[PDB]
Symmetry: none
Subunit: 97 residues, 4 copies
């Protein structure tokens, strides 16, 4: 089935890492040869994106017919007391009918 979900993970710290989770057939259709599997899962796996920024991944998902459904963001900071270093991780859940 061409329908399904695709989770887009982004681990940033304010060249980051972009993750793609979901069925393999859906990941290869939207992202092509930018996938890099890292198993750590039946018919689904997690991939890392090369030669692709976050905005480009959105354009690939938008043209493929996916829409953002859920978004799980979380960040933690560490300290003088005015300057902090944030380390966030966001998951954008996309779905295609």
């Amino acid at each position: 089935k061409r329908s399904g979900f695709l989770t887009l993970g982004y681990r940033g710290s304010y060249v980051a890492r972009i993750m793609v989770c979901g069925r393999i057939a859906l990941a290869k259709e939207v992202f092509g040869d930018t996938l890099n599997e890292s198993r750590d899962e039946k018919y689904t796996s997690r991939f890392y994106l090369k030669f692709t920024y976050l905005e480009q991944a959105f354009d690939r998902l938008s043209e493929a017919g996916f829409h953002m459904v859920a978004c799980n963001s979380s960040g933690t900071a560490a300290f003088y007391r005015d300057d902090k270093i944030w380390s966030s991780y966001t998951e954008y859940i996309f779905f295609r009918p």
Copy 2:
């Protein structure tokens, strides 16, 4: 004087409740009489007459900084209707 404060915002995209968890001394110092205990979320404390932006101003003037955060927002068929629940962790040295 030092310690943590937790905010629990459950909004949509203005009728959102703001849960507060932490020491009673720090919560009373920042929010004052806007603290209320629901006699009906492990703290049962919420904020009256206070939006999320106003809660950030009270924490900033009191000397608290956002050290951690975790948001989770879903969407239903409607653009769309987004329902997000966010937990803010504030800390004052």
Copy 3:
């Protein structure tokens, strides 16, 4: 699944360990509860970090403030699960 958990306790170096967060996350991690300012509280040997570590939570922040003689401190631990 995700969320924060806070463990605050007033000791004299030990009283109850108050728990902050959601009731769903509190009962999922702990088999103990109660009825600071927190409705739920755990009274144990302070080895609840294991019940938090294997459950998926990690210590992300900590703050201990004590005053004097005998010291009366109040420590707050911040745990988070992705």
Copy 4:
């Protein structure tokens, strides 16, 4: 003669200057020429153990301790501990 003094200490123990807060008369008496203007000052040629000895020999007792530590992704820890001393 009597007053308060605070010793700020910052560290970064992943997976260290010393600050002094108080009156210039009390800070100059305890730490001599080790403190420099940053009132607030920072110490040189002095560790945390030696700073406690200078306050102990001067008559200051530790009355408060506020230790804090924040982490960020097995992570980068940023700890800040200040000791509040007082002499009658």
